[PDB]
Amino acid sequence: RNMFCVKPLDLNLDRHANTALVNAVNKLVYTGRLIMNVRRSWEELERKCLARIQERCKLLVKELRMCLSFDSNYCRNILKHAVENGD
Amino acid sequence: GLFSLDRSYEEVKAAVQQLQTITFRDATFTIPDPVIDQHLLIDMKTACLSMSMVANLASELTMTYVRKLALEDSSMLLVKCQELLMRLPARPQHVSPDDEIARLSALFVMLRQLDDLIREQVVFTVCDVSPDNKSATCIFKG
């Protein structure tokens, strides 16, 4: 839900049960799954933003095209750039 | 020799008196002149080194066997040997046969070192006795 407040605090693994290897594997899989989840959420929001801004650029260029003025052509030229990267 | 270290003169006197007397096959023999020279000092030094290396090499499995057996077995052997010892389920927290065998081999070398202090060299092996026990026929081992 919120990838900025990292809470890696799941340390509760008591030693009496399970062999040491399984304890280590459980800690490792927990950390790995946290990293994977945060990276996945980041990428999904990034691609949503890119898709939405590309759609808006398309619609706004289509609308500004209808008038051929200096201001309108200047705005279309600004929107003409591809926006499929963060940079 | 080992007991002589840091025990009073009279305490060592009493200990030497009691350790002198040996009973073996229903006859009693006494050691003449147990004297702590340098010749026994070398043996004491190697005994201390051998014991310390045994203690450092022995694994927690080796140490804890006695304690674990005492919790679930009872016998004259066990109660006797634990009376000789200090006083104080769950899984073993480290398990590795390869480490255990390497450690056991080194411990075998050390236990040979310690045994050679009391172990005399065999010179004859007996297979006969005259019924009066005056003579025997033996194989020479030298």
Swiss-Prot record, chain A:
Protein name: Large structural phosphoprotein
Function summary: Participates in the last steps of viral maturation and release. Associates with nuclear capsids prior to DNA encapsidation and later preserves the integrity of nucleocapsids through secondary envelopment at the assembly compartment. Interacts with host CCNA2 and thereby blocks the onset of lytic gene expression to promote establishment of a quiescent state of infection in undifferentiated cells.
Compartment(s) of residence: Virion tegument; Host cytoplasm; Host nucleus
Record's signal peptide: none
Post-translational changes noted in the entry: Phosphorylated by host CCNA2.
Species for this entry: Human cytomegalovirus (strain AD169) (HHV-5)
Assigned protein family: Belongs to the herpesviridae large structural phosphoprotein family.
UniProt feature coiled coil, ranges: none
Subunit field text: Interacts with host BICD1 and RAB6A. Interacts with small capsid protein UL48A; this interaction links together the capsid and pp150. Interacts with host CCNA2.
Curated annotation (Swiss-Prot), chain B:
Signal peptide boundaries: none
Record's subcellular location: Virion; Host nucleus
Primary role: Structural component of the T=16 icosahedral capsid. The capsid is composed of pentamers and hexamers of major capsid protein/MCP, which are linked together by heterotrimers called triplexes. These triplexes are formed by a single molecule of triplex protein 1/TRX1 and two copies of triplex protein 2/TRX2. Additionally, TRX1 is required for efficient transport of TRX2 to the nucleus, which is the site of capsid assembly.
Family note: Belongs to the herpesviridae TRX2 protein family.
Subunit organization: Interacts with TRX1 and major capisd protein/MCP.
Protein name (database record): Triplex capsid protein 2
Gene from which the chain derives: TRX2
